[PDB]
Design a protein around this ligand. Structure first.
Ligand SMILES: Nc1ncnc2c1ncn2[C@@H]1O[C@H](COP(=O)(O)OP(=O)(O)OP(=O)(O)O)[C@@H](O)[C@H]1O
Ligand SMILES: [Mg+2]
Ligand SMILES: [Mg+2]
Lengths: 395, 33, 146, 83, 105, 118, 55
RNA sequence: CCAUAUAUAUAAUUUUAAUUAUAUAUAAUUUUAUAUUAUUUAUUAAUAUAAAGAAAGGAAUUAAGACAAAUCAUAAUGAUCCUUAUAAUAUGGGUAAUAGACGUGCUAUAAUAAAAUGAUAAUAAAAUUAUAUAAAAUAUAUUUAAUUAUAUUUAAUUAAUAAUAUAAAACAUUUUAAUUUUUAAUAUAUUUUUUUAUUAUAAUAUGAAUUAUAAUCUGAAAUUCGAUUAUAUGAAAAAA
């Protein structure tokens, strides 16, 4: 173990020694039978969610054999009923830091996996905003593409989603990309994909040169926008980082910081969010979630109508363009409520069955007293503080 | 000691400068202008 | 007095008052702390104990207490007469040995080094047992002068 | 090891930091301006540079007032004061 | 429109939270001069605010930055006991006492 | 003068620690708490401060029976948390005077005298 | 922020005219702080006391 | 006498901090009960355990001897010396010189520790403002903005009102040479902000002295000899 504590607990496979437990499996179809119970995800859900990056460090996932989730009536069931019922399915998940926004997003991902939908998850958009991977200006797409990040993201889209579902979609145009496949790079210089013969799976497996990769990304998104046989769920976790970083760390040939919307990824994300890119299915949804690690400013609450527009607020603390885009698409908020005492009881019960609680709590303390004390210490229902009061408060 | 503030409700309805002029209108400065 | 509050008082007649803090953990964290940065010391200790739990899957506080009780020497020769040690002094000696062992490891983070040192001690692998044995041997050799 | 104008750089070194570290006239802002001009992304490292890009850095630095020329200017200021 | 123009032209002297326009003068040696000066300033401000024939400044929003900066320097205790936490059922109830009633006779 | 609940059933108490002061309204409830109108974990980032605030309720095993509306000012996090602790203990005595002794034995009814002294 | 600078300049000029303030949009050094500085001569001069004392 | 705890008074609760202010008074140098130890045998003391208490700190206040002290700048008196000069004024210079030696302090020599960021603004106290204080805004450095430093303009307040002034550590994320413990290309994965495979991959991104250039600030004046900012420079400092 040579890394720091967070990266160690994230990457040291410390759950190898976690005791197995037979939890019920997440199934929104059978929500009634799992409501207010700790559940595990399916095997398919686990594979897809790991490729999506639904699980993150500092979630205490290593405590348990696999990531698990309390299926909550006021968060999970309520949000998913809105996700199935609402006519315009564009959401921003909000709530206090550590309340469960990312877990709610992963439960939405699992619902999508079991609902036969394609999921494009931009987890942690700081990768394409921090200037730690390459970029180049594309002249056809009047945008700065980021080939390394696009390669990683296209592989994630391929891996996470059901291959049969993704092959069901026939291409609606003809495409010609630079060939970068090592075997036939020389024999064949350009790979060509025809209409009604090659599928979105074929396009999504294309190997092209970095400068052309941006076009591939467009080809993918356009294609998924035109098809009407598969719903598309487009998710962005830590979306707040985008709202409070309007200018990326990249700087153009004149040494000026590049606007986030001048990046292909920024333009893509905000086009999907603003509705400029329309998905033809009608069950397609966009789910955004803010994060507590990012700074707050006026952009988000103004875009949600919570506070009026103060036009003298400096651009650092108020970006009107993002408000314009978030309002153009009728993005509505879902605030994750804090846990009630009964949900705390259920979670602590599951934690007891996982042999995670300290002896000072289980051995010699009354159960009701334990529940009351940890409901108090968690700030009346914050899940992260609940866990930290259980497994990380040795005092 | 005592300080008194008086509040009166009511119906709605330079030494340097006067010397700078004197210096500028002096022969010592007027000759450069 | 009302009957409900008389019943409450009767119920609490038997219950012992809960402890404000764990004295041993308080001592250890205060030994980690410098410059009054207590929260940082508590974070280091709790993170190390979290690693200990995750690798042994037992109550890490109990493991730490067993480790300190076993590793610390019961007596020590001082200027040359053996003298008995109280619990706090024993914990100081044992903790210093543990920290010295942990700072021979590779991780940049002190919490990781300390946690895996405490895991190794909880599994009976520590060089400070030799230090304890040497101290005990000197005390036996000088028992005549007590 | 990559070589620019007779200066060696460990592969992992960040270009904008390394250039400011090793060249006399170049500072943080100047190095960032050079990297922006050549299209290097902010945290690109020396081992990622192609030989054409190495030559582009060499040309850009040669057009700068750095190393011996800048040192001569400084020594000339000091000598002229001494005179 | 004239009230808006007044506030815009008052700038930092106007406090939107209290609706108070305040200005002070101590540039003249005597208080009567300073009072007449302040009255004359007010007259000019009102005359310009009512003169909407050239510019009403309706496109300029009201700048409250000076007031925000002022408010950040004073602690704000803007919280009240939750209404739904109240337990009037638990309040003490006056108990009958015969002596006092027979003494109020 | 015997203390009692107000017209809303609240026990009002004041505690001090270092240069911090706290005024707490304790009413019978379900273990809710607000500090300066903010969630406990929001206002107090250190867990040990929350444990200090909870300790008097834990002494009388009455966490989960009371709603706390604490309001602090002055000093820093530790001083404010411990002034809330003291104020809660004093307020709790009103609901059941027979427990005062036990609270007095816990140490939460004793005002900590220590303060910065050049 | 979105408000054009011409509108705010007009506001600043008109306000300065109303309240008898120096409007200096160019930002040139005018020495106005010298004119507005208070005369401290009397307090400084009375430092050692009133010389017209009975002796 | 402070402080601490409490009571009364005062405040038309917009000078708000009523969780406050400052007048007066009260309180403790605490007290009771057992048990064990000793006892000058209890009506003593200590320890422990119970009970009531908010109760746990601090300062001042007199003389007598001995020695030191003339920046004794803690004086007075006396003696002695100068009186065109040992008195008095102005201009400039010095007290800032640099071989050494030492005292004290500040900044450092990196990962239980530094940096950056954190706007419905986490959390203070005690002071200061008529020989002032400087808000917000605008402009330049300068780069969308922010930050930082100046300039322009001086809003309010001579103050429980306004300003100096959104305290800072804390905490959270990100980053960090030495370190191949890393980065990158391809595959790879039920660790995806990540894993795995194969390929390439003693002074730093610590420190901030010194010096150069260009600005700024106060002042009549910054040369000997002041402060600040930007762009460069980048020393010594590792072990005991
Ligand atoms: N419904 C839930 N069931 C079980 N555990 C949960 C649930 N919601 C949150 N948690 C756990 O609580 C902690 C909160 O982490 P999570 O990533 O969900 O928070 P968040 O609100 O997204 O945080 P942030 O503000 O950092 O983005 C994690 O341990 C998560 O596993
Ligand atoms: Mg999250
Ligand atoms: Mg440095």
């Amino acid at each position: 173990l040579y890394k720091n504590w967070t990266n160690t607990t994230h990457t040291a496979q410390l759950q190898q020694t976690a005791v197995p437990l037979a939890l019920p499996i997440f199934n929104f179809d059978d929500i009634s039978k799992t409501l207010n119970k700790v559940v595990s995800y399916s095997n398919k859900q686990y594979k897809s969610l790991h490729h999506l990056g639904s699980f993150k460090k500092s979630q205490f996932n290593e405590l348990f054999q696999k990531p698990v989730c309390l299926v909550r009536e006021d968060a999970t069931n309520s949000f998913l009923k809105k996700l199935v019922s609402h006519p315009v399915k564009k959401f921003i998940i909000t709530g206090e830091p550590g309340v469960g926004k990312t877990v709610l997003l992963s439960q939405a991902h699992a619902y999508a996996v079991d609902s036969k939908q394609i999921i494009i998850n931009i987890s942690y958009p700081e990768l394409f905003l921090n200037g730690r991977n390459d970029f180049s200006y594309d002249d056809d797409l009047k945008l700065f593409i980021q080939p390394m990040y696009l390669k990683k993201l296209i592989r994630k889209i391929l891996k996470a989603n059901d291959p049969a579902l993704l092959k069901s979609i026939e291409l609606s145009k003809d495409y010609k990309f630079s060939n970068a496949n090592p075997k036939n790079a020389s024999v064949k210089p350009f790979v060509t994909l025809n209409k009604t013969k090659n599928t979105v799976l074929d396009l999504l497996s294309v190997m092209t040169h970095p400068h052309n990769r941006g076009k591939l990304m467009k080809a993918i998104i356009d294609e998924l926008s035109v098809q009407s046989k598969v719903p598309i769920m487009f998710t962005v976790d830590n979306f707040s980082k985008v709202l409070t970083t309007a200018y990326s760390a990249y700087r153009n040939t004149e040494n000026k910081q590049i606007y986030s919307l001048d990046l292909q990824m920024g333009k893509l994300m905000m086009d999907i969010i603003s509705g400029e890119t329309k998905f033809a299915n009608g069950e397609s949804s966009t789910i955004l979630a803010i994060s507590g690690v990012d700074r707050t400013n006026k952009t988000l609450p103004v875009a949600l109508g919570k506070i009026p527009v103060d036009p003298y607020v400096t651009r650092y603390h108020y970006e009107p363009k993002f408000v314009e885009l978030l309002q153009k698409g009728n993005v509505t908020e879902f605030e994750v409520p804090k846990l009630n005492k009964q949900e705390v009881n259920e979670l602590i019960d599951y934690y007891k069955q996982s042999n995670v609680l300290l002896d000072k709590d289980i051995t010699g303390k009354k159960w009701e007293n334990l529940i009351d004390e940890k409901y108090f210490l968690s700030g009346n229902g914050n899940p992260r503080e609940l866990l930290k009061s259980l497994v990380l408060s040795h005092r | 000691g005592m300080k008194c503030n008086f509040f009166q409700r009511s119906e709605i309805s330079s030494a340097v400068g006067q010397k700078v002029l004197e210096l500028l209108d002096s022969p010592d400065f007027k000759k450069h202008l | 007095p009302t009957a409900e509050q008389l019943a409450q008082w009767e119920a609490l007649k038997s219950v012992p008052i809960p402890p404000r803090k764990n004295a041993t953990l308080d001592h250890i964290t205060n030994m980690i702390m410098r410059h009054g940065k207590k929260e940082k010391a508590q974070t280091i200790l709790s993170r190390a104990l979290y690693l200990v739990y995750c690798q042994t899957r037992q109550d890490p506080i109990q493991a730490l207490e067993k480790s300190l009780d076993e590793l610390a020497p019961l007596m020590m020769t001082k200027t040359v007469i053996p003298v008995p040690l109280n619990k706090r002094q024993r914990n100081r000696i044992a903790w210093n040995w543990i920290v010295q062992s942990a700072n021979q490891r590779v991780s940049s983070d002190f919490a990781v080094r300390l946690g895996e040192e405490l895991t190794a001690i909880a599994k009976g692998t520590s060089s400070a047992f030799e230090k304890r044995d040497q101290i005990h041997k000197t005390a036996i050799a000088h028992r005549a002068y007590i | 090891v990559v070589h620019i104008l007779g200066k060696g750089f460990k592969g992992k070194e960040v270009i904008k930091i390394a250039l400011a570290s090793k060249f006399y006239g170049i500072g943080k802002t100047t190095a960032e301006k050079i990297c922006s001009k050549l299209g290097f992304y902010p945290w690109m490292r020396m081992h990622q540079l192609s030989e054409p890009q190495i030559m582009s850095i060499a040309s850009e630095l040669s057009t700068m007032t750095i190393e011996g020329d800048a040192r001569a200017i400084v020594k000339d200021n000091i000598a002229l004061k001494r005179k | 429109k004239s009230l808006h123009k007044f506030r815009i032209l008052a700038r930092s002297r106007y406090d939107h939270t209290t609706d108070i326009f305040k200005m002070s003068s101590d540039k003249f040696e005597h208080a009567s001069q300073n009072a007449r000066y302040l009255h004359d300033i007010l007259q000019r401000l009102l005359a310009e605010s009512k003169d909407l024939t050239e510019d009403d400044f309706s496109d300029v929003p009201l700048d409250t930055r000076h007031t925000i900066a002022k408010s950040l320097r004073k602690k704000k205790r803007d919280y009240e006991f939750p209404e739904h936490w109240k337990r009037p059922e638990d309040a003490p109830k006056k108990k009958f006492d015969i002596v006092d009633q027979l003494l109020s006779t | 003068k015997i203390k009692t609940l107000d017209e809303f059933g609240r026990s009002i108490a004041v505690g001090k620690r270092k240069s911090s002061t706290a005024k707490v309204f304790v009413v019978r409830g379900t273990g809710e708490i607000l500090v300066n109108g903010r969630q406990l974990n929001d206002y107090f980032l250190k867990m040990k401060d929350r444990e200090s605030i909870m300790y008097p309720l834990q002494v009388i095993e009455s966490v989960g029976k009371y709603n706390i509306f604490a309001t602090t000012s002055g000093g820093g996090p530790t001083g404010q948390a411990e002034s809330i602790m003291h104020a809660i203990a004093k307020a709790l005595v009103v609901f059941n005077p027979l427990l005062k002794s036990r609270l007095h034995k816990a140490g939460v009814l004793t005002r900590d005298y220590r303060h910065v002294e050049r | 922020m979105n408000v054009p600078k011409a509108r705010l300049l007009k506001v600043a000029e008109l306000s300065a005219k109303i309240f008898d303030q120096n409007f200096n949009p160019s930002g040139i050094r005018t020495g106005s702080k010298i004119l507005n500085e208070r005369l401290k001569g009397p307090s400084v001069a009375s430092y050692y006391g009133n010389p017209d004392i009975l002796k």
